[PDB]
Structures are given as C-alpha cells and as structure tokens.
C-alpha cells in the first residue's frame, strides 16, 4: 500500500551527473506505473538501463525511454508493443511531472517525459503517472544540453536505474 520509488542515475558523455528519484502513482494509474517500474528494474529481460534522453527542450521537457531504436521510434511496454491510455485523472501542473509520450490515443510503450514547466495543453492527451521526488536539480542540469529543436549537445544516458522502494 505504498507507491514505488524508482531512480535513474544520469551520466553526460559517460560522466556521472547524479540521481533523480521518482514517485510513481500506482494508486492512480497502476498499469502505467507498473510498466515504468518493471522497465526500470529490467526484470522482464529488457528496460531503461543504458538508454538515452533523445529529445530535450529547455523550459518544456526531457524525453527518453526508447531502448530499442534510441531515436524516438521504438520501445515497447511489458504488456506487448503498446497499451491503452489508462486514465487522465492527473494533469501537467508544473515542473517535475512524469508523463507518457505516445503516437496518439492508446499507444503507450516505454517513452516518457519529465516536465520542466506547467504544460496544460498536454492534459487529456498524455497520461501523467509520477513525479520527481528528489534530484529536480539534476533535471535542471540536464536541460542545459538541450535545444529549441530537441537535439542534445551531449549524450545524456541512464547509467543505472532500479527500484528503491
């Protein structure tokens, strides 16, 4: 009866930057939260470890999760390639929101984004399922390698990840 806490250790060109901890709202979106949790432990044989943040736009968000093609076209869920939009109870209310990227209605795989600002235009379209619990300062340092068009100037990698609780 406790929401999982997951962590990512971020590296910039192999150099360790720090740890970001996330609280996953398994009490509101159990199946989206579980997908993210299991991809962070790597327990199904595949996951986030070693993958990158392929698209970062300062003031907007940091996008990652494509562990198969590393460019925005791949990734899959623990349920098969894609799964449904569970619900839209939570909104993109400010910095630190963790939400799912997609290619339209009911197309969730493994790609996600961490909001750097309130992005109310994404409400009802992207499922919010967690928030940054510790290390928002590491996300702010990550944005500095992003650009208006999303290209990063440095390789931002998840060097390790797992579950803390």
């Amino acid at each position: 009866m406790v929401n999982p806490t997951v962590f990512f250790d971020i590296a910039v060109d192999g150099e360790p930057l720090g740890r970001v901890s996330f609280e996953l709202f398994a009490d509101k979106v159990p199946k989206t939260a579980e997908n993210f949790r299991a991809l962070s432990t790597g327990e199904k044989g595949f996951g986030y470890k070693g993958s990158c943040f392929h698209r970062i736009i300062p003031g907007f968000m940091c996008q990652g999760g494509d562990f198969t093609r590393h460019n925005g076209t791949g990734g899959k869920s623990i349920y098969g390639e894609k799964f449904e939009d569970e619900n839209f109870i939570l909104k993109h209310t400010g910095p630190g929101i963790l939400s799912m990227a997609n290619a339209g209605p009911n197309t969730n795989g493994s790609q996600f984004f961490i909001c750097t600002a309130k992005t109310e235009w994404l409400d009802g379209k992207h499922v919010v399922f967690g928030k940054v619990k510790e290390g928002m300062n590491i996300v702010e340092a990550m944005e500095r390698f992003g650009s208006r068009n999303g290209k990063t100037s440095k390789k931002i990698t998840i060097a390790d990840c797992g579950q803390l609780e």
């Binding site: 996008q63 494509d66 925005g72 990734g75 990227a101 290619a103 790609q111 992005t119 994404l122 992207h126």
Partner: peptide
C-alpha cells in the same frame, strides 16, 4: 511547437 510524440514529431 511543443508536443511530445513518438515517431512523427510536430512543430
């Protein structure tokens, strides 16, 4: 513009 998609990214 400022969207978050997987595959065809929009302006």
């Amino acid at each position: 513009x400022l969207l978050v998609x997987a595959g065809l990214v929009l302006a």
